[model samples]
Target: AEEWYFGKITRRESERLLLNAENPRGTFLVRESETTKGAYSLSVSDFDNAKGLNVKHYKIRKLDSGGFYITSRTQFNSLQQLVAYYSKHADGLCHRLTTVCP
Candidate 1:
């Protein structure tokens, strides 16, 4: 089975993506430019309406066969926090699996 992991971007990671060309702002985009492996990208935005506090928006995109095969977005903070927490835990496992598995 395919392993799945998710995480919320750190403040540092968020800043990098906002400014980096590899990932852009407003259009926050990540792409699997050149790779033979499974790859994906994610983007985020913040918006404010006249009625209430500002809110953060997010989108996740997965590329498959040169097309955007998966796309999703949400305004749920819980979802973001869950993703961030899981990402942190999964990262450790991924490192161990990649480096120690034989």
Candidate 2:
């Protein structure tokens, strides 16, 4: 889909999109991993008043045991659930997932 689940976008392009001035704090998206098979990447736009604008990327993995996870301890049955959990809290991420790229 053209939504948050961006497909086959390169890391550099993802960085550029998240770093765009048009995107604000917490804006984020998920894309297919450039190098990993059956893996995904989450990019978040983190605008810190002190540290300045930073884009964070987390590798999302699909385990053989089943489910998906960014951090191994926090696994979810689906990507939607994983995204939902991250949106509610930053957890280990630089920022929470607030708005998806439009």
Candidate 3:
């Protein structure tokens, strides 16, 4: 189980729970990247191990949103590209920030 902000939940488990089905919270969000924005935090590729998913992927904003509602479908080939890609298209879906202090 992956440790979420609240507790542990696997991707498939979360999918089974319909975490964002009825709501507009946007199910898959990019969390692995603290700086680079993306969809699906872990990426279907990360845990899948075969590498078909991507850091840059599509997200259905409204199931009726415009084509521009998607982010760059950039399959980064190198560090240079990953760096260059997000530099231009960093503002993807669910983009936000927060802070914690003690």
Candidate 4:
């Protein structure tokens, strides 16, 4: 099955994929963190009138209980659940996830 997760991609690559004029303000994708152990990162496109388009990367931490969370206040048993939850709300992120990198 296809998913938004892109395993082991470099941070530079992730930024390139997300920070683009074609992607909307909330476009997002998940990628493995370069310096983290068994953790992931969520890259989202954000636009500013002064700064133009940029990508924001949020750390996705994994739990010993087999859960995933960007922040401890909100956790999920699966990455899909985490993605689903964030898609509808910005939470602490820069913007709500509107599009998956397809």
**Model 3 stretches astray by more than 4 angstroms:** 1-4, 19-21, 25-90, 94-102
TM-score for model 1? 0.26
- Residue 41's lDDT in candidate 2: 93
Best by TM-score: 4
Q: Please write out the lDDT profile of model 2 over residues 8-31, one tens digit for every residue.
A: 888888888878767778988999
- Candidate 1 local lDDT, 20-82, one digit each (tens): 443221323232323224433333322235632221223333333333322233222333343
- Alpha-carbon TM-score of each model against the true structure: 0.26, 0.88, 0.24, 0.91
Quote the positional error of residue 45 for candidate 3 in Å: 17
lDDT by residue (tens digit), candidate 3, 4-97: 2212344454344433234222223322333233322322111124642222223322112212123345454332333334434445523211
All candidates in order of TM-score, best leading:
4, 2, 1, 3
**Least accurate 10 contiguous residues by lDDT in model 1:** 93-102
What does the lDDT come to for candidate 2?
Answer: 0.86
Q: What is the lDDT of residue 10 in candidate 4?
A: 81
Better of 2 and 3 by lDDT: 2
> In model 3, where is the ten-residue run with the lowest total lDDT?
93-102
How does residue 10 of candidate 2 score in lDDT? 82
Q: What are the C-alpha RMSDs, in order, of all predicted structures?
A: 16.7, 1.7, 14.5, 1.3
Q: Each model's C-alpha lDDT?
A: 0.31, 0.86, 0.30, 0.86
| Cα lDDT, model 4, residue 45 | 86
User: What is the lDDT for 9 in model 1?
Assistant: 43
